[PDB]
Amino acid sequence: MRHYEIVLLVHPDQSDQVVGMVERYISQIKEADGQIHRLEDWGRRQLAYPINKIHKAHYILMNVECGQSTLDELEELFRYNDAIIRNLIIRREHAITEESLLAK
Amino acid sequence: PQVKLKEGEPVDVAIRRFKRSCEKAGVLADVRKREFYEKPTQERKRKKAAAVKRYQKKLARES
Amino acid sequence: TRTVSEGVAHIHASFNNTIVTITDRQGNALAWATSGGQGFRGSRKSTPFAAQVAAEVAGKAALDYGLKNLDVLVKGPGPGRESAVRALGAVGYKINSITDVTPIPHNGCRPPKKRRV
Amino acid sequence: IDYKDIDTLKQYITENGKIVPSRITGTKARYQRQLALAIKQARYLSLIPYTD
Amino acid sequence: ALTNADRAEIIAKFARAENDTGSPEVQVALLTAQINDLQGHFKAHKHDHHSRRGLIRMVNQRRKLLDYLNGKDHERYTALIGALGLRR
RNA sequence: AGUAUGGGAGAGGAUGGUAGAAUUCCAGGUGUAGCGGUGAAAUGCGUAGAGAUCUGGAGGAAUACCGAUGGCGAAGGCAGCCAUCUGGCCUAAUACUGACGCUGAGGUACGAAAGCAUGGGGAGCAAACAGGAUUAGAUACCCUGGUAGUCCAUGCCGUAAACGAUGUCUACUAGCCGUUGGGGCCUUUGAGGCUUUAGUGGCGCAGCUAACGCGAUAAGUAGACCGCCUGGGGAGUACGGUC
Ligand SMILES: [Mg+2]
Ligand SMILES: [Mg+2]
Ligand SMILES: [Mg+2]
Ligand SMILES: [Mg+2]
Ligand SMILES: [Mg+2]
Ligand SMILES: [Mg+2]
Ligand SMILES: [Mg+2]
Ligand SMILES: [Mg+2]
Structure with a gap:
């Protein structure tokens, strides 16, 4: 299993559903096997430039350890989830647990 | 640029400041560059000449 | 008929001509003039x-x-x-701000070939 | 230098949003490359604007 | 991509002495393993000529080592080729 | 000369996805005379409404700034961002094999752009071509349009001022100044100063050279192997053969 850092932007109207989606994603990693090192919710933020005419979005960041399956499964979930508007996945070496800037 | 103007700012001085800001930005040179397509070999030669001139300038300053 | 308190001015300056269009906010046109149209139809269209x-x-x-x-x-x-902008100030408009909006492509379309003159 | 350090990323960005050259700012080659990568990541994630 | 455990198992199988990692047997075994591993990659990417050059280099090095071993001792060479399942 | 184990830098290669700027075209809003182009013009576009500005949509191609005698690759050549597969290089110590090496006739692999065959795609640019100008003439240079092509998949083609106009490998021969990736040592005010290694640049002693110049990245001093030349044209041509 490798280490991945995932940042997701979520449409504001579905901001109340963020807790369910993050819970389901975490449950998938745990049931597969995985290891979840970080999970931060930055909250609503004004975007530097509009995306799809949206000017504010909800930011959620997560650092996990998983395998290729768990991975491609998560990317296709993000692909077919309408609430998620833009995602960034960066591979990392070793896990990061320290609190990151912009936490709240 | 976005040169916001003070209540008593004269138009001429405002235009001078706007020209200074545009010169700092360098948009005009970028606009000029794209007027005609320049070939990669010519661009590489131009950059080589620029580097050669820069190094000579540095040596002259050090001297 | 229509009355508006604030507006925008767009100056399309090229190497052969200058267009000045005064519009309201949201870009609806109100007036427009051209250097070539206002007489001076020749190489002088590009003169200040x-x-x-x-x-x-x-x-x-x-x-x-x-x-x-x-x-x-x-x-x-x-x-x-x-x-x-000098002419606008002379005629009496109070210029709140002046900004440049010249497009800059990020290496998109290929420009035409170099002239051999 | 990471993509989440918006303050230090801004310290190396002009008013127009362009990345300042190393020759002017005074940084080293590795730091300059890492910081350019971070700025591109932040631009994509919309933490900082591409232009203007 | 073969792992450290796999490489260690190969070295354990073909070691002639404790801490022996530079013998022709071990070198040829490792080269054969990695050559077999890369075959899967090279069907999925038929136009990776840049990596195919490294593959050819591996093959050439294996051939040189086998020739040296055969020249210096025939019994070891025959046993090695029999164990590794290589024609020549 | 090669192997195992820890770290490091990189536009090295292949497959897929994704983001911003801009051009073009298509609808709608405001609005009414020019727009465009050159040395000057004219062709062309516009009152069945152009150009200008705003909103929305379609599609192709390339990735500003960073950017750098910077980086990587055998050469050709490689630039936004993310994932997957994958080659080489550098660097410290220990531990292994024990000459396992250099070069290389035939042969074989790769090999810019243009061009060729099948299928797709086509915004911008543009051989051919058409029109407007200049000129004594214009089959051109300038201007308005514009096809193949430039793009994608699968193959062929074997060519370039494919250049450092400098074949590969090894050892030795004053110094000074930059820069990229590592190792080691010393100061402190947290960044600096010394060394060494592998690249990449500027001077320069000796030596070499017809001269210009090269000069530890040799064109110096020596060794191993290969390719090539023998006045200018005819001529990289004809005949024969191979592809
Ligand atoms: Mg033109
Ligand atoms: Mg050879
Ligand atoms: Mg033409
Ligand atoms: Mg392909
Ligand atoms: Mg030739
Ligand atoms: Mg070349
Ligand atoms: Mg030659
Ligand atoms: Mg012939």
Whole structure:
């Protein structure tokens, strides 16, 4: 299993559903096997430039350890989830647990 | 640029400041560059000449 | 008929001509003038004087709508870009701000070939 | 230098949003490359604007 | 991509002495393993000529080592080729 | 000369996805005379409404700034961002094999752009071509349009001022100044100063050279192997053969 850092932007109207989606994603990693090192919710933020005419979005960041399956499964979930508007996945070496800037 | 103007700012001085800001930005040179397509070999030669001139300038300053 | 208090001015300055269009906010047009149209139809279209005359006539025409404060957006190269704002100030518009909006491609389409003159 | 350090990323960005050259700012080659990568990541994630 | 455990198992199988990692047997075994591993990659990417050059280099090095071993001792060479399942 | 184990830098290669700027085209809003182009013009576009500005949509191609005698690759050549597969290089110590090496006739692999065959795609640019100008003439240079092509998949083609106009490998021969990736040592005010290694640049002693110049990245001093030349044209041509 490798280490991945995932940042997701979520449409504001579905901001109340963020807790369910993050819970389901975490449950998938745990049931597969995985290891979840970080999970931060930055909250609503004004975007530097509009995306799809949206000017504010909800930011959620997560650092996990998983395998290729768990991975491609998560990317296709993000692909077919309408609430998620833009995602960034960066591979990392070793896990990061320290609190990151912009936490709240 | 976005040169916001003070209540008593004269138009001429405002235009001078706007020209200074545009010169700092360098948009005009970028606009000029794209007027005609320049070939990669010519661009590489131009950059080589620029580097050669820069190094000579540095040596002259050090001297 | 329509009355508006604030508006925008767009200066399309090129190497052959200068267009000055005074619009309201949201981009609906109110007046427009051209250096070549305002006489001076020749190589002098690109001279600063023609741009100044065009700006003067455009401002005088737009004064009918009761515009006192203007925002200036200038596009592209060409002599006469500076003359437009000077003419607007002379005719009496209070310029809130002046900004440049010239497009910059990030290495997109291929430009035409070099002239051999 | 990471993509989440918006303050230090801004310290190396002009008013127009362009990345300042190393020759002017005074940084080293590795730091300059890392910081350019971070700025591109932040631009994509919309923490900082591409232009203007 | 073969792992450290796999490489260690190969070295354990073909070691002639404790801490022996530079013998022709071990070198040829490792080269054969990695050559077999890369075959899967090279069907999925038929136009990776840049990596195919490294593959050819591996093959050439294996051939040189086998020739040296055969020249210096025939019994070891025959046993090695029999164990590794290589024609020549 | 090669192997195992820890770290490091990189536009090295292949497959897929994704983001911003801009051009073009298509609808709608405001609005009415020019727009465009050159040395000057004219062809062309526009009152069945152009150009200018705003909103929305379609599609192709390339990735501003960073950017750098910077980086990587055998050469050709490689630039936004993310994932997957994958080659080489550098660097410290220990531990292994024990000459396992250099070069290389035939042969074989790769090999810019243009061009060729099948299928797709086509925004911008543009051989051919058409029109407007200049000129004594214009089959051109300038201007307005514009097809193949430039793009994608699968193959062929074997060519370039494919250049450092400098074949590969090894050892030795004053110094000074930059820069990229590592190792080691010393100061402190947290960044600096010394060394060494592998690249990449500027001077320069000796030596070499017809001269210009090269000069530890040799064109110096020596060794191993290969390719090539023997006045200018005819001529990289004809005949024969191979592809
Ligand atoms: Mg033109
Ligand atoms: Mg050889
Ligand atoms: Mg033409
Ligand atoms: Mg392909
Ligand atoms: Mg030849
Ligand atoms: Mg070349
Ligand atoms: Mg030659
Ligand atoms: Mg012939």
